[PDB]
Amino acid sequence: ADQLTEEQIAEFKEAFSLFDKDGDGTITTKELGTVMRSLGQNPTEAELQDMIIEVDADGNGTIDFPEFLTMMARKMKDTDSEEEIREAFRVFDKDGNGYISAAELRHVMTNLGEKLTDEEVDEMIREADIDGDGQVNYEEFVQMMTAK
Protein backbone atom coordinates (compact mmCIF):
# COMPACT_ATOMS: atom_id res chain seq x y z
CA ALA A 1 0.00 0.00 0.00
CA ASP A 2 1.17 3.63 -0.26
CA GLN A 3 0.95 4.16 3.51
CA LEU A 4 3.91 1.86 4.21
CA THR A 5 6.39 -0.04 2.07
CA GLU A 6 6.62 -3.84 2.03
CA GLU A 7 10.09 -3.40 3.56
CA GLN A 8 8.45 -2.21 6.79
CA ILE A 9 6.05 -5.17 6.66
CA ALA A 10 9.11 -7.41 6.60
CA GLU A 11 10.20 -6.13 10.03
CA PHE A 12 6.65 -6.50 11.41
CA LYS A 13 6.78 -10.11 10.21
CA GLU A 14 10.28 -10.89 11.53
CA ALA A 15 9.46 -9.38 14.94
CA PHE A 16 6.28 -11.48 15.10
CA SER A 17 7.97 -14.68 13.87
CA LEU A 18 10.60 -14.23 16.59
CA PHE A 19 7.94 -15.39 19.05
CA ASP A 20 5.92 -17.67 16.71
CA LYS A 21 7.26 -20.81 18.39
CA ASP A 22 4.64 -23.19 17.07
CA GLY A 23 4.93 -21.95 13.50
CA ASP A 24 1.17 -21.60 13.23
CA GLY A 25 1.44 -17.86 12.69
CA THR A 26 0.46 -17.10 16.30
CA ILE A 27 1.89 -15.52 19.47
CA THR A 28 0.52 -15.44 23.00
CA THR A 29 -1.54 -12.48 24.23
CA LYS A 30 1.31 -11.48 26.57
CA GLU A 31 3.96 -11.78 23.86
CA LEU A 32 2.27 -8.88 22.03
CA GLY A 33 4.20 -6.44 24.20
CA THR A 34 7.46 -8.23 23.42
CA VAL A 35 6.81 -8.15 19.65
CA MET A 36 6.17 -4.39 19.82
CA ARG A 37 9.31 -3.95 21.92
CA SER A 38 11.29 -5.85 19.26
CA LEU A 39 10.13 -3.17 16.80
CA GLY A 40 11.54 -0.56 19.19
CA GLN A 41 8.28 0.78 20.70
CA ASN A 42 7.27 0.10 24.31
CA PRO A 43 3.48 0.20 24.93
CA THR A 44 1.94 0.94 28.32
CA GLU A 45 0.76 -2.07 30.34
CA ALA A 46 -2.59 -0.33 30.81
CA GLU A 47 -3.30 -0.06 27.07
CA LEU A 48 -1.97 -3.60 26.52
CA GLN A 49 -4.54 -4.90 28.98
CA ASP A 50 -7.40 -3.41 26.94
CA MET A 51 -5.85 -4.46 23.60
CA ILE A 52 -6.18 -8.08 24.72
CA ILE A 53 -9.91 -7.77 25.52
CA GLU A 54 -10.67 -6.49 22.01
CA VAL A 55 -9.24 -9.71 20.51
CA ASP A 56 -9.43 -12.44 23.18
CA ALA A 57 -12.12 -11.52 25.71
CA ASP A 58 -12.40 -15.22 26.68
CA GLY A 59 -8.73 -15.43 27.68
CA ASN A 60 -7.66 -18.34 25.43
CA GLY A 61 -4.19 -16.79 25.48
CA THR A 62 -3.26 -16.31 21.79
CA ILE A 63 -3.28 -13.65 19.04
CA ASP A 64 -2.76 -14.60 15.37
CA PHE A 65 -0.68 -12.74 12.78
CA PRO A 66 -3.55 -11.28 10.78
CA GLU A 67 -5.09 -10.03 14.05
CA PHE A 68 -1.78 -8.46 15.07
CA LEU A 69 -1.71 -6.70 11.69
CA THR A 70 -5.40 -5.72 11.96
CA MET A 71 -4.67 -4.06 15.31
CA MET A 72 -1.98 -1.90 13.67
CA ALA A 73 -4.20 -1.23 10.65
CA ARG A 74 -7.00 0.02 12.94
CA LYS A 75 -4.79 2.76 14.40
CA MET A 76 -3.31 3.55 10.98
CA LYS A 77 -6.66 4.91 9.76
CA ASP A 78 -6.74 8.61 9.00
CA THR A 79 -7.78 11.08 11.71
CA ASP A 80 -8.14 14.84 11.39
CA SER A 81 -6.73 15.83 14.80
CA GLU A 82 -3.33 14.09 14.77
CA GLU A 83 -2.62 14.60 11.06
CA GLU A 84 -3.07 18.40 11.13
CA ILE A 85 -0.35 18.73 13.79
CA ARG A 86 1.89 16.27 11.94
CA GLU A 87 1.71 18.30 8.71
CA ALA A 88 3.65 21.22 10.17
CA PHE A 89 6.25 18.91 11.73
CA ARG A 90 7.05 17.01 8.48
CA VAL A 91 9.23 19.86 7.21
CA PHE A 92 11.57 19.70 10.23
CA ASP A 93 12.59 16.04 9.99
CA LYS A 94 15.06 16.53 7.14
CA ASP A 95 16.60 13.07 7.30
CA GLY A 96 13.47 11.00 7.97
CA ASN A 97 15.11 9.99 11.24
CA GLY A 98 12.14 10.41 13.62
CA TYR A 99 14.45 12.33 15.94
CA ILE A 100 15.42 15.98 15.36
CA SER A 101 17.96 18.17 17.15
CA ALA A 102 16.69 19.85 20.35
CA ALA A 103 17.73 23.13 18.72
CA GLU A 104 15.27 22.45 15.89
CA LEU A 105 12.46 21.46 18.26
CA ARG A 106 13.18 24.75 20.03
CA HIS A 107 12.67 26.49 16.69
CA VAL A 108 9.26 24.80 16.24
CA MET A 109 8.25 25.88 19.76
CA THR A 110 9.21 29.46 18.90
CA ASN A 111 7.51 29.45 15.48
CA LEU A 112 4.27 27.93 16.82
CA GLY A 113 3.84 30.83 19.21
CA GLU A 114 2.72 31.07 22.85
CA LYS A 115 6.13 29.69 23.80
CA LEU A 116 6.28 29.06 27.55
CA THR A 117 9.45 29.83 29.56
CA ASP A 118 12.46 27.61 28.93
CA GLU A 119 11.95 25.82 32.27
CA GLU A 120 8.34 24.90 31.38
CA VAL A 121 9.41 23.58 27.96
CA ASP A 122 12.25 21.58 29.57
CA GLU A 123 9.69 19.28 31.19
CA MET A 124 8.75 17.94 27.77
CA ILE A 125 12.29 17.99 26.35
CA ARG A 126 13.49 15.81 29.24
CA GLU A 127 11.27 12.88 28.35
CA ALA A 128 11.89 13.12 24.61
CA ASP A 129 15.73 13.45 24.71
CA ILE A 130 17.95 10.49 23.73
CA ASP A 131 21.47 10.62 25.20
CA GLY A 132 22.91 8.41 22.47
CA ASP A 133 21.85 10.72 19.64
CA GLY A 134 21.68 14.15 21.30
CA GLN A 135 18.31 14.46 19.59
CA VAL A 136 14.71 14.57 20.78
CA ASN A 137 11.97 12.49 19.16
CA TYR A 138 9.49 14.51 17.08
CA GLU A 139 6.85 11.88 16.26
CA GLU A 140 5.68 10.85 19.73
CA PHE A 141 6.11 14.50 20.73
CA VAL A 142 3.26 15.36 18.33
CA GLN A 143 1.02 12.74 19.92
CA MET A 144 1.96 14.00 23.41
CA MET A 145 0.57 17.42 22.40
CA THR A 146 -2.91 15.89 21.92
CA ALA A 147 -2.99 12.74 24.11
CA LYS A 148 -1.75 11.51 27.50
CA angle 21, 33, 48 (to 5 degrees): 130
Burial 12-51 (b: 16+ CB within 10 A, else e): bbebbeebbeeeeebbebebbbebbebeeeeeeeeeeeeb
SS3 145: coil
Residue 32 sits in a domain whose CATH number is 1.10.238.10
Question: Which amino acid is residue 116, in one-letter code?
Answer: L
C-alpha 14/C-alpha 17 separation (Å) is 5
SS3 95: coil
Number of CB atoms found within 10 A of residue 102's CB: 14
DSSP state of 97: -
Q: Which residues are annotated as a binding site for Ca(2+)?
A: 20, 22, 24, 26, 31, 56, 58, 60, 62, 67, 93, 95, 97, 99, 104, 129, 131, 133, 135, 140
**Domain coverage including residue 18:** 6-76
Residues 6+ apart with CB under 8 A from 20: 26, 27, 65
